[PDB]
Amino acid sequence: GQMSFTFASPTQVFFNSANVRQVDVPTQTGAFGILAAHVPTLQVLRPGLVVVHAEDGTTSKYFVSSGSVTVNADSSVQLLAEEAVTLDMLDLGAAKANLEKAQSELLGAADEATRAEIQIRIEANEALVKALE
Amino acid sequence: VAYWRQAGLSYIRYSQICAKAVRDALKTEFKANAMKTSGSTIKIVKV
Amino acid sequence: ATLKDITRRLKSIKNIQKITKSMKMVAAAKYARAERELKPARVYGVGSLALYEKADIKTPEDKKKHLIIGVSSDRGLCGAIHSSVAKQMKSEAANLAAAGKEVKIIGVGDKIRSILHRTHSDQFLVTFKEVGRRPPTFGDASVIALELLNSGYEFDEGSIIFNRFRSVISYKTEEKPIFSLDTISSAESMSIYDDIDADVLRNYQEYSLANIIYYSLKESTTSEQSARMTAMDNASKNASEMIDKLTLTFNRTRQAVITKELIEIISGAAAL
Amino acid sequence: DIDTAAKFIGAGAATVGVAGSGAGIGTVFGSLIIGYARNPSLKQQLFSYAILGFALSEAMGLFCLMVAFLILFA
Amino acid sequence: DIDTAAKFIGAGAATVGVAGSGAGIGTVFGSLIIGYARNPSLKQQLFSYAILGFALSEAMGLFCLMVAFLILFA
Amino acid sequence: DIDTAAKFIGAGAATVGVAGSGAGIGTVFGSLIIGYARNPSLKQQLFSYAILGFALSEAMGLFCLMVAFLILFA
Amino acid sequence: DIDTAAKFIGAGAATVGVAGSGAGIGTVFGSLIIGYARNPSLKQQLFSYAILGFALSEAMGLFCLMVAFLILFA
Amino acid sequence: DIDTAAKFIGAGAATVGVAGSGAGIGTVFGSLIIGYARNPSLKQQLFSYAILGFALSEAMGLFCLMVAFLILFAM
Amino acid sequence: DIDTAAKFIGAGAATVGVAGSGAGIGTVFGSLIIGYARNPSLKQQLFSYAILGFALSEAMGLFCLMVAFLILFA
Amino acid sequence: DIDTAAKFIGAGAATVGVAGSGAGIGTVFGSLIIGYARNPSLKQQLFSYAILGFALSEAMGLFCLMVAFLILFA
Amino acid sequence: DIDTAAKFIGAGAATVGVAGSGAGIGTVFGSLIIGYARNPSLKQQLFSYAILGFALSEAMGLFCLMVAFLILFA
C-alpha cells in the first residue's frame, strides 16, 4: 500500500513517481486528500495549494493555479498543474493589490464572457490571499 | 457546470486566467522567469 | 573551365560552407536549449497520458468523425521532419477514409499545410504559422486546443502525429490517439473512476487535449532542432569536400594558363 | 383526580416532541461537518447557516416543552 | 371529569407530531449546507429552496399544534 | 362519557402520524437542494420531481389527519 | 362502554404507523432527485426503480391502515 | 372486560413498529437508486443487495406484527 | 384484572422500539449499496462492515422486543 | 391511586424523547466519519465540530430525562 | 393493582427510547461503509470513530432501557 506520486508544471517537476503518504488537493468539486489506496477519480483543480506529506512527517505546500488530478487503480496519483509555485515565490502585497483591483473592475460588467473572466480573476486572487495569509 | 462555463468559456481559458493571475502575483525576481516561458506566439490562418 | 569560372565557383562554395557552419552552430545551440527544456515536458506528457494508458479506452467503431493533427514547423532545411510527418498524416487519412469516416486535418506549421495543399486541399480545418521561431510554450498549446474546440467540428476520435525525439541522430515519427467525452463516458473501463460527472469530464478532456498538444510540440521542437543540426553538418561537410577538388582544379588551371601564356610569349619572341 | 392524572400523562406525552429536535439538529451538525470537509474556506458562512438551522429547528422542541408546561400548569 | 383528562392526554399525544417536522427542518438545513459547499455560487437560489422547504415542513408541525388546540380549547 | 374520552385520546394519537410526512418533506426538499447545487442546469426537472415527492409524501399526512377527524366525529 | 372506547384508542394508536411510509417515500424521492442530477441519462430506469421502491414503501403504510380499519371495525 | 378492551390498544400500539420498517425500505431503495446512478453497470448485483437489505429491514420489523397478532389472539 | 390488561398494553407499547432498528438496518444496507457501487474493487470488506452494523442494529431492535415479551410473559 | 399511576405513565412516556437525541448522535458521528474520510487532514477541527454536535444534541436527551425525573419526584 | 399496572405501562413506553439508538447505530455504520469506500487507508481511524459513535450513541438507548427497568422494578 504505497503511492506513486507524480506532480509537474509544464516547465518544472516536483515529484516524479515518488513515495508520499498523503496529498491534499483542490478539485472544482471540493478539497480532498489522497492516500495510499484512495478510490480512483479524475478531477480538475481550482487555484489552491496542494500540500504533500512524505513518508517522514514533513509538509511541502505548492500553490497550483489550475490543472488536473488523476487517482488510479494502482494508487498512482498524477497531479498536473499549469502553474505551481512554492509559497515563498509569491508577493502578499501584490496579490492583495490585484484582488482589490479585480474587485474594482467587477463593476464593469462589459458582457457575460468578460464578467466571468473578471470573476475568475477575483476568485484566483482570493485563493492567493487566503493561502499567503 | 460553473459560473464561467455558463458564460461560454472552457477549462483551457479558465486555466489561462488562473495561471495569468498567479504569474502576475510573483516576486519581482521570479516574475522574469515566469513571463518568458509562458508567452504565446502561434498565429492562425483562416480556412 | 576558365580560371574566372573556377574563381567564382570557389567563392560561392566557400561562402556556402561558411553559412552552413554558422547554421550548424546556431541549430546546435537551439537544440541544446530545447533538450534542456524537454526533460520536464516529457514527464508532464507521460503523466497526461497515464489515464488513457492504464484505463483502457477504445472508441467504438461506429463513430463517423475523426481528426488528424500533424505537428511540424516552418523553417526549412530540417530534413525529413515535414516529409515524414505529412506522409504519415496522409497514410492515416486515406486509411480512415476507406472506412467511410469524415476525416479532418489540422496542421501546426506552414510546411504541413504547404505539403498537403494539393491533396486533402479541403479537409483542412485550421493550420497555424509562426512555429519553431521560438520554443513552443504551454500558451501555444492552449491556443491550439482552444482553436480546435471552438471550430465547428466535434470530432469523435482523433490522432496527433509528431516526431518523438530519440537521440541526436535518431527520431521516430509517432502517433498518439485522443478521445472525446462522448466516448470517455461510455467506456466500461471508466466505471471504476469515482466522482465523475459528465461535466468534470469535459473540463478534464479539454485539459488533456492541451496537454498532449503541448507535449507533441515540445517533442517536435527538439527533434527538428537536432535534425537541422545534422542536415547542416552534412551540407557543410559536403561543401568542404567539393572545395577539396575545386581548389585542385583552380591550381591546375592556373598553372596550365601560366604555362600556355609563357609558351605563347616565347613563340612570339622566337618569331621576331 | 383524573385531571391531576392527565396533568402528568399528557405532559409526559408532550415531551416526546423533543426527540424531533434531537434528531433534526444532529443532522445539521452532521451536514456542517461534511460541508466543511468539502470546502473548508467557507467555514464562516457554513457556521452561519448552521446556527440558523439549529435555532430554527430546536425552536420546535421548545414549542413541545412549552406545550408540556402549559398542560402541567393550565 | 374524565373528558378533561382525555382532552389533556389527546393534546399531549397530538403534539408529538411536531418532532417529525423538527427532524425535517434539520434535514433541510443540512442539505442547504452541503449544496452550498459544493456550489457556493448559488447561495440565493439554494436559500430560496431552503426557505420553501422549512416553511412547507413546519406547516405540518403547525397542523399538529392546531390539532392539539382544537382538542383542548375547542 | 368514557367513549367520548377514548375518541379524544385515539384521535390525538392518530394525529401523531404526520411526523413521517414532516420528515419526508424535509428529506425531499433537502435532496432537491443538493441535487440542484450538484447540477444547476436541471432546475425544472429536479423541481418537478420534488413536487411529485411532496405530493406522495403528503398524501400520508393528510391521511393521518383524515382518519383523526373520522375518529373524532365518528 | 369500555369495548368501543378501547377500540377507538387502539385504532388511533395503530394508524400512526404510516409515519414510516411517509418518511420512506420522502427518502425514495430524495434519492431519485439526487441520482437523476448525477446521471441525467438514466432517468427512465431511475424512475422505474423509484416507483418500485415507492410501491414497496406504500405496502407497509397501507397495511398499517388496514390493521387500523380492521380493529376499528372488528 | 378490561382485558378484552386493553388488548385492542395493545395491538394498536404494537402495529406502529411497521413505521421504522417502512422508512428503512424507503432508504434501502433510495440507496439503490443512487448507487445505480453511480455505477449503472452493476445493475443486477446492486439490486441483489437491495433485496437482501429490505428483506432483513422488513423481516426484523415484521416481528412487531407477530407480537401484535399474538396480543390480539393468543393472549 | 387490570394487571392482565396492563401487561398486554405495556407489551404493545414496548414492541414499538423495533421501528428504530428497522430504520437502522435499512440505512446500513443502503450505505452498503452506495459504497459498493462507488468502489466495487473492495466489496468483501464493505459487506463485513455492513454485517457488523446490521448485527448491532438488530441488537437494539431486539432489546425492546425482549422487554416486551418479558412484560408479557413475566 | 390514579395520581401515582398516571405519574408512572408520564415518566415512562417522557423518556422516549431521548430517542431523537440518540439518532442525532448517530447521524453526527456518521457525518464525522464521512468528512474525515474525504479530508483526513482536518481531523482536529472536524472532531471539534463533532464533539460540539454531540454535546449540543445530547442536551436534548438530558432535557427529556430531567423532565421524566421531575415528573416523578416533583 | 393500579400501581402495578402503571409500572407495566411506564416500563413498556420508556422502552421505546432505544429506537433512537437503533437508528443512530445504523447511520454510523453506514457512514463507516461509505467513508471506507473512499479512503481504505484510514480503516483504523475510521473504525475508531465508528466504535466511538456506536458506544456514545448506544448510551442513550441504554439510558432509556435502564429507566424502563427502574420503573418496572423500583
Swiss-Prot record, chain A:
An annotated Gene Ontology molecular function: proton transmembrane transporter activity
Keyword Signal set for record: no
Superkingdom of the source species: Eukaryota
Cellular location(s): Mitochondrion; Mitochondrion inner membrane
One Gene Ontology term, aspect cellular component: mitochondrion
Keyword Phosphoprotein: no
Residue(s) carrying N6-succinyllysine: 101, 130
Keywords (A to Z) from UniProt: Acetylation, ATP synthesis, CF(1), Hydrogen ion transport, Ion transport, Membrane, Mitochondrion, Mitochondrion inner membrane, Transit peptide, Transport
N6-acetyllysine: residues carrying this PTM: 101, 130
An annotated GO BP: mitochondrial proton-transporting ATP synthase complex assembly
Cited function: Subunit delta, of the mitochondrial membrane ATP synthase complex (F(1)F(0) ATP synthase or Complex V) that produces ATP from ADP in the presence of a proton gradient across the membrane which is generated by electron transport complexes of the respiratory chain. ATP synthase complex consist of a soluble F(1) head domain - the catalytic core - and a membrane F(1) domain - the membrane proton channel. These two domains are linked by a central stalk rotating inside the F(1) region and a stationary peripheral stalk.
Record family assignment: Belongs to the ATPase epsilon chain family.
Protein name: ATP synthase F(1) complex subunit delta, mitochondrial
Curated annotation (Swiss-Prot), chain B:
Task performed by this protein: Subunit epsilon, of the mitochondrial membrane ATP synthase complex (F(1)F(0) ATP synthase or Complex V) that produces ATP from ADP in the presence of a proton gradient across the membrane which is generated by electron transport complexes of the respiratory chain. ATP synthase complex consist of a soluble F(1) head domain - the catalytic core - and a membrane F(1) domain - the membrane proton channel. These two domains are linked by a central stalk rotating inside the F(1) region and a stationary peripheral stalk.
Quaternary organization: Component of the ATP synthase complex composed at least of ATP5F1A/subunit alpha, ATP5F1B/subunit beta, ATP5MC1/subunit c (homooctomer), MT-ATP6/subunit a, MT-ATP8/subunit 8, ATP5ME/subunit e, ATP5MF/subunit f, ATP5MG/subunit g, ATP5MK/subunit k, ATP5MJ/subunit j, ATP5F1C/subunit gamma, ATP5F1D/subunit delta, ATP5F1E/subunit epsilon, ATP5PF/subunit F6, ATP5PB/subunit b, ATP5PD/subunit d, ATP5PO/subunit OSCP.
UniProt GO cellular component terms: mitochondrial inner membrane; mitochondrion; proton-transporting ATP synthase complex
UniProt entry keywords in alphabetical sequence: Acetylation, ATP synthesis, CF(1), Hydrogen ion transport, Ion transport, Membrane, Mitochondrion, Mitochondrion inner membrane, Transport
Gene Ontology terms describing biological process: proton motive force-driven mitochondrial ATP synthesis
Domain of life of the source: Eukaryota
Location of N6-acetyllysine modifications: 20, 31, 36, 43
Main subcellular localisation: mitochondrion
Keyword Flavoprotein applies: no
From Swiss-Prot, chain C:
Subunit relationships: Component of the ATP synthase complex composed at least of ATP5F1A/subunit alpha, ATP5F1B/subunit beta, ATP5MC1/subunit c (homooctomer), MT-ATP6/subunit a, MT-ATP8/subunit 8, ATP5ME/subunit e, ATP5MF/subunit f, ATP5MG/subunit g, ATP5MK/subunit k, ATP5MJ/subunit j, ATP5F1C/subunit gamma, ATP5F1D/subunit delta, ATP5F1E/subunit epsilon, ATP5PF/subunit F6, ATP5PB/subunit b, ATP5PD/subunit d, ATP5PO/subunit OSCP.
Protein's UniProt name: ATP synthase F(1) complex subunit gamma, mitochondrial
Job of this protein: Subunit gamma, of the mitochondrial membrane ATP synthase complex (F(1)F(0) ATP synthase or Complex V) that produces ATP from ADP in the presence of a proton gradient across the membrane which is generated by electron transport complexes of the respiratory chain. ATP synthase complex consist of a soluble F(1) head domain - the catalytic core - and a membrane F(1) domain - the membrane proton channel. These two domains are linked by a central stalk rotating inside the F(1) region and a stationary peripheral stalk.
Biological processes, Gene Ontology terms: proton motive force-driven ATP synthesis; proton motive force-driven mitochondrial ATP synthesis
Localization annotation: Mitochondrion inner membrane
Highest taxon above the source species: Eukaryota
Organism: Bos taurus (Bovine)
Cross-referenced Pfam families: ATP-synt
UniProtKB/Swiss-Prot annotation, chain H:
Spans through the membrane: 16-36, 51-71
Compartments reported by the entry: Mitochondrion membrane
Site label Reversibly protonated during proton transport, positions: 58
Keywords assigned by UniProt, alphabetized: CF(0), Hydrogen ion transport, Ion transport, Lipid-binding, Membrane, Methylation, Mitochondrion, Transit peptide, Transmembrane, Transmembrane helix, Transport
Gene Ontology biological-process entries: proton motive force-driven ATP synthesis
Gene Ontology MF terms in the entry: lipid binding; proton transmembrane transporter activity
Residues bearing the modification N6,N6,N6-trimethyllysine: 43
GO cellular component terms given for this protein: mitochondrial membrane; mitochondrion; proton-transporting ATP synthase complex; proton-transporting two-sector ATPase complex, proton-transporting domain
Top-rank taxon, per record: Eukaryota
Membrane topology: Multi-pass membrane protein
PTM comment: Trimethylated by ATPSCKMT at Lys-43. Methylation is required for proper incorporation of the C subunit into the ATP synthase complex and mitochondrial respiration.
Miscellaneous note of the record: There are three genes which encode the ATP synthase proteolipid and they specify precursors with different import sequences but identical mature proteins.
Disease link: This protein is the major protein stored in the storage bodies of animals or humans affected with ceroid lipofuscinosis (Batten disease).
Recorded family membership: Belongs to the ATPase C chain family.
Quaternary structure and interacting proteins, as annotated: F-type ATPases have 2 components, CF(1) - the catalytic core - and CF(0) - the membrane proton channel. CF(1) has five subunits: alpha(3), beta(3), gamma(1), delta(1), epsilon(1). CF(0) has three main subunits: a, b and c. Interacts with DNAJC30; interaction is direct.
